Write a protein that binds this ligand. Sequence first.
Ligand SMILES: *[C@@H]1O[C@H](CO)[C@@H](O[C@@H]2O[C@H](CO)[C@@H](O[C@@H]3O[C@H](CO)[C@@H](O)[C@H](O)[C@@H]3O)[C@H](O)[C@H]2NC(C)=O)[C@H](O)[C@H]1NC(C)=O
Ligand SMILES: *[C@@H]1O[C@H](CO)[C@@H](O[C@@H]2O[C@H](CO)[C@@H](O[C@@H]3O[C@H](CO)[C@@H](O)[C@H](O)[C@@H]3O)[C@H](O)[C@H]2NC(C)=O)[C@H](O)[C@H]1NC(C)=O
Ligand SMILES: *[C@@H]1O[C@H](CO)[C@@H](O[C@@H]2O[C@H](CO)[C@@H](O[C@@H]3O[C@H](CO)[C@@H](O)[C@H](O)[C@@H]3O)[C@H](O)[C@H]2NC(C)=O)[C@H](O)[C@H]1NC(C)=O
Ligand SMILES: *[C@@H]1O[C@H](CO)[C@@H](O[C@@H]2O[C@H](CO)[C@@H](O[C@@H]3O[C@H](CO)[C@@H](O)[C@H](O)[C@@H]3O)[C@H](O)[C@H]2NC(C)=O)[C@H](O)[C@H]1NC(C)=O
Ligand SMILES: *[C@@H]1O[C@H](CO)[C@@H](O[C@@H]2O[C@H](CO)[C@@H](O[C@@H]3O[C@H](CO)[C@@H](O)[C@H](O)[C@@H]3O)[C@H](O)[C@H]2NC(C)=O)[C@H](O)[C@H]1NC(C)=O
Ligand SMILES: *[C@@H]1O[C@H](CO)[C@@H](O[C@@H]2O[C@H](CO)[C@@H](O[C@@H]3O[C@H](CO)[C@@H](O)[C@H](O)[C@@H]3O)[C@H](O)[C@H]2NC(C)=O)[C@H](O)[C@H]1NC(C)=O
Ligand SMILES: *[C@@H]1O[C@H](CO)[C@@H](O[C@@H]2O[C@H](CO)[C@@H](O)[C@H](O)[C@H]2NC(C)=O)[C@H](O)[C@H]1NC(C)=O
Ligand SMILES: *[C@@H]1O[C@H](CO)[C@@H](O[C@@H]2O[C@H](CO)[C@@H](O)[C@H](O)[C@H]2NC(C)=O)[C@H](O)[C@H]1NC(C)=O
Ligand SMILES: *[C@@H]1O[C@H](CO)[C@@H](O[C@@H]2O[C@H](CO)[C@@H](O)[C@H](O)[C@H]2NC(C)=O)[C@H](O)[C@H]1NC(C)=O
Ligand SMILES: *[C@@H]1O[C@H](CO)[C@@H](O[C@@H]2O[C@H](CO)[C@@H](O)[C@H](O)[C@H]2NC(C)=O)[C@H](O)[C@H]1NC(C)=O
Ligand SMILES: *[C@@H]1O[C@H](CO)[C@@H](O[C@@H]2O[C@H](CO)[C@@H](O)[C@H](O)[C@H]2NC(C)=O)[C@H](O)[C@H]1NC(C)=O
Lengths: 356, 356
Amino acid sequence: ETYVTGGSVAHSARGLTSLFSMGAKQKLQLVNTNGSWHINSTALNCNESINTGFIAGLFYYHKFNSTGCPQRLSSCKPIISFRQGWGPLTDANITGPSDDRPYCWHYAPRPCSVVPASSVCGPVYCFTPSPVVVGTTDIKGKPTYNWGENETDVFLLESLRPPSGRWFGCAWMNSTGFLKTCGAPPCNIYGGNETDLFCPTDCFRKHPEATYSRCGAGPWLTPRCMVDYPYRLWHYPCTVNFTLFKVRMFVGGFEHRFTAACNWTRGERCNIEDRDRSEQHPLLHSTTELAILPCSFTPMPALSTLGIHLHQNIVDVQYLYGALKWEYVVLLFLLLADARVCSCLWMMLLISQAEA
Amino acid sequence: ETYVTGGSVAHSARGLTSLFSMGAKQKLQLVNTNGSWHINSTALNCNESINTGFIAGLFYYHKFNSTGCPQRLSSCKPIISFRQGWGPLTDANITGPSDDRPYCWHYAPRPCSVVPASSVCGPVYCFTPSPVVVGTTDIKGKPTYNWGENETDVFLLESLRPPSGRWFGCAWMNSTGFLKTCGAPPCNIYGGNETDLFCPTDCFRKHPEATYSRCGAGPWLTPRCMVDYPYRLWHYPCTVNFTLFKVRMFVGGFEHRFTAACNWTRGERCNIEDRDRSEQHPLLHSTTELAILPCSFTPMPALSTLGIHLHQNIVDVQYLYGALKWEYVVLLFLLLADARVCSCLWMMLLISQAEA
Ligand SMILES: *[C@@H]1O[C@H](CO)[C@@H](O[C@@H]2O[C@H](CO)[C@@H](O[C@@H]3O[C@H](CO)[C@@H](O)[C@H](O)[C@@H]3O)[C@H](O)[C@H]2NC(C)=O)[C@H](O)[C@H]1NC(C)=O
Ligand SMILES: *[C@@H]1O[C@H](CO)[C@@H](O[C@@H]2O[C@H](CO)[C@@H](O[C@@H]3O[C@H](CO)[C@@H](O)[C@H](O)[C@@H]3O)[C@H](O)[C@H]2NC(C)=O)[C@H](O)[C@H]1NC(C)=O
Ligand SMILES: *[C@@H]1O[C@H](CO)[C@@H](O[C@@H]2O[C@H](CO)[C@@H](O[C@@H]3O[C@H](CO)[C@@H](O)[C@H](O)[C@@H]3O)[C@H](O)[C@H]2NC(C)=O)[C@H](O)[C@H]1NC(C)=O
Ligand SMILES: *[C@@H]1O[C@H](CO)[C@@H](O[C@@H]2O[C@H](CO)[C@@H](O[C@@H]3O[C@H](CO)[C@@H](O)[C@H](O)[C@@H]3O)[C@H](O)[C@H]2NC(C)=O)[C@H](O)[C@H]1NC(C)=O
Ligand SMILES: *[C@@H]1O[C@H](CO)[C@@H](O[C@@H]2O[C@H](CO)[C@@H](O[C@@H]3O[C@H](CO)[C@@H](O)[C@H](O)[C@@H]3O)[C@H](O)[C@H]2NC(C)=O)[C@H](O)[C@H]1NC(C)=O
Ligand SMILES: *[C@@H]1O[C@H](CO)[C@@H](O[C@@H]2O[C@H](CO)[C@@H](O[C@@H]3O[C@H](CO)[C@@H](O)[C@H](O)[C@@H]3O)[C@H](O)[C@H]2NC(C)=O)[C@H](O)[C@H]1NC(C)=O
Ligand SMILES: *[C@@H]1O[C@H](CO)[C@@H](O[C@@H]2O[C@H](CO)[C@@H](O)[C@H](O)[C@H]2NC(C)=O)[C@H](O)[C@H]1NC(C)=O
Ligand SMILES: *[C@@H]1O[C@H](CO)[C@@H](O[C@@H]2O[C@H](CO)[C@@H](O)[C@H](O)[C@H]2NC(C)=O)[C@H](O)[C@H]1NC(C)=O
Ligand SMILES: *[C@@H]1O[C@H](CO)[C@@H](O[C@@H]2O[C@H](CO)[C@@H](O)[C@H](O)[C@H]2NC(C)=O)[C@H](O)[C@H]1NC(C)=O
Ligand SMILES: *[C@@H]1O[C@H](CO)[C@@H](O[C@@H]2O[C@H](CO)[C@@H](O)[C@H](O)[C@H]2NC(C)=O)[C@H](O)[C@H]1NC(C)=O
Ligand SMILES: *[C@@H]1O[C@H](CO)[C@@H](O[C@@H]2O[C@H](CO)[C@@H](O)[C@H](O)[C@H]2NC(C)=O)[C@H](O)[C@H]1NC(C)=O
């Protein structure tokens, strides 16, 4: 039976919180719009503070009328559906209309340019692996000079890859409540019935070295897991059901720690092919057990030896705790032979190779 | 007394190797040239194979006539000599003549462009943290079109930062016998008697977040240490006295392991200010002892707590092996009070914060 150990779930992180007792009055529910399913932005208070939004997200665990969520998610595809990849990576060129629904894990965004705050509701979140909030500054002052009309305090992101730039990608909702995100260019894996995946994240199974650091640009680490943040339920509705995990990234030399949610349910077939690469780092750095994303692994070989050791029935666990007898025997035989010159040569060879 | 433990030295990695008995006949020594000190390219066989050059480097431990080395090194400067840095990084733009001697650790190179092989001797080495050799391919065929005249098989590097590109920087020695190197653009740390350091490496002490991954482009990790490779003496002569160490980088998500040498002698004052940031990772991943670069550290905090623990006398060591009694006592007092609602609230708070 496939299950987890360290999986923390926030579906009922509440008790006797009936002081509000009803959605804290900012009802969050999906509606259809000419065959399109987004959040009902009408009631959906917009100009709140960070603490008010934090309380609102705190009270949202149960009242989710997830009715149209399946048919909305029908647009998304599993990683299997795409075609193979090969060759050296290239940087894609996202242009023209993007008919794809952005909430899918594999949505290629446009480069993060300027954006007027007159058409955004809620905070805007950039996703240097540890999520961050982005503020504003008045457009009327700077020569940015009126992308719209009498607007003020436009957001600007304009970031390169986080090792050089500031963040991978950022997300928000526009005024009508539709998800809108941008990010760094993703990886094309073909230039050098199915569809060509543009790999906005760690598409390990479809391309070997397309790691998150090189390719990923956005909230998605694996096609199964994502980085959590206070407005995660805000921006992405359907991912309510997810379970949290502890993550240590270590991107760009610096250290990054945060939480991650996942498309995980007990009993999912996860034999060997449903494993995705993700660069983790030890949290406690001991006990030889690593809490890793479910249906995943990390490229850190074990202590004594190499070869990733993973448990059949629990996927979140990464195992550790899985010598030159020949050379020592040869050296001892040489010593018995008393060939000191040969003994000295063997000692030098061991120092160069065995000892080094 | 300041000394090391894991420091391996290859100054006498030899014994009874007198078959050649003289430098394998390609005697290597420095000479002056109009006030400039480069290698004796005259004798200096050029068209050797990898194995022949490897044997040559194997036999080069003792016959190094270190006469002009000090006055040649007089051009280099210690990290103290430069000025402070601040603000967000920028990418510098190296143009025009570069009068600085490239062998200094702090030499800013030009972008790695094409280069005709008719003016290079020996292998060319690109320094993706684990050093690699670069081959050639005929210039006459492709759209390169004859940089010189009737030349063939020119080198091309044209790489971005290794997370996106292929290597940080590459080096070689040009036909007349002078070091020639290129690399990714370095970090300017001021745009956003002493001189302005352009930071081609991990200039941690002069700029806090100028890590190697963001800034470094070339063989130098620290102003004290440098990644080793077979033709290290071939390119940099004066660095013979260096001592080797093991290094685990973890660059761009992938894993890198190689050897590093350092400007280290016993007795160097290394109290607290002579420590340079460098990202290592555990080799054996146990025993709580890390063999790191001397006079350095690593942003990988200890197991139980944080705070880099470093021994006063031996520098190569990084120490590991340096709880909510308050909350537990509060919860237990609440339980004794039998305030179940308060007890439930405390349990939820602990789950949200203490347990998470
Ligand atoms: C979390 O994981 C579950 C499990 O994969 C996801 O449910 C899956 O959603 C897809 C998309 O609609 C379903 O595929 C579709 O099935 C219909 C009906 O067979 C078919 O007509 C479509 O062509 C498409 O193949 C899939 O059946 C469904 N699987 C299960 C077990 O429910 C869910 O969407 C994921 N949610 C998130 C937020 O990641
Ligand atoms: C918030 O984002 C949504 C998602 O894109 C926006 O909806 C889209 O809005 C554009 C223009 O506002 C619509 O384009 C117009 O519609 C026709 C329909 O064929 C299209 O062909 C033309 O290009 C025309 O310009 C687009 O259809 C519409 N799509 C959906 C699914 O609603 C919405 O306008 C954004 N609102 C704000 C305030 O930013
Ligand atoms: C996240 O997990 C919860 C826990 O089960 C899911 O809630 C359950 O979802 C199913 C699917 O719609 C509900 O079944 C339907 O219920 C309605 C109303 O009772 C009924 O009219 C339908 O015929 C069908 O039986 C189920 O009631 C519901 N249970 C609870 C306690 O909410 C939830 O659906 C999961 N998230 C997503 C996006 O699926
Ligand atoms: C390895 O480390 C040693 C120790 O720093 C380096 O030796 C140092 O080299 C510099 C450069 O010439 C010397 O500074 C110069 O000193 C002269 C004489 O005082 C002065 O006139 C110059 O203006 C300049 O300040 C420094 O004294 C010298 N220190 C020692 C202890 O020898 C050596 O160059 C390093 N080698 C490599 C390959 O890294
Ligand atoms: C191999 O690399 C060395 C190191 O740069 C080259 O030596 C340099 O060569 C240039 C032109 O060949 C010399 O520039 C010339 O010298 C005067 C001196 O005032 C300079 O003002 C002019 O710009 C003139 O072009 C440069 O002085 C010289 N420097 C040294 C230290 O030797 C060498 O030419 C390269 N060899 C090949 C075959 O590419
Ligand atoms: C690497 O370490 C070796 C070991 O000490 C250094 O070799 C020594 O270098 C000193 C400095 O030049 C030599 O002293 C000089 O020796 C010459 C010839 O004997 C003498 O005429 C001078 O008056 C002065 O005393 C010393 O002899 C030499 N020892 C050996 C065994 O080679 C070497 O210099 C170091 N590397 C560098 C680049 O400095
Ligand atoms: C969840 O939202 C759906 C949206 O369709 C609700 O379905 C509608 O419910 C009303 C009354 O409850 C009916 O008059 C409509 O005909 C329903 N729509 C359809 C398409 O059948 C559903 O009731 C909501 N459920 C909850 C628990 O809020
Ligand atoms: C482990 O070995 C098996 C056979 O020993 C390999 O092939 C799998 O065999 C099972 C048994 O029928 C199939 O259900 C799987 O579909 C096979 N794998 C594939 C990729 O087709 C395989 O080397 C290993 N098993 C798996 C599941 O990969
Ligand atoms: C180092 O370079 C010098 C050039 O100044 C070489 O000196 C000449 O080398 C040639 C070739 O062996 C001889 O024919 C000349 O007689 C040498 N002249 C002098 C004044 O030395 C020297 O041989 C080189 N050393 C090497 C290659 O080991
Ligand atoms: C190391 O190189 C220096 C070159 O400066 C050699 O010193 C020269 O020796 C010659 C004769 O042997 C004389 O012209 C001078 O004594 C030096 N020339 C200078 C200083 O310009 C030195 O002999 C070499 N060492 C060894 C061991 O060969
Ligand atoms: C260790 O603490 C000392 C004082 O408690 C700090 O200042 C150093 O004090 C010594 C004693 O005279 C001086 O020699 C050093 O020059 C002082 N440091 C500096 C940077 O000037 C300091 O926090 C620590 N020591 C050092 C060398 O940094």
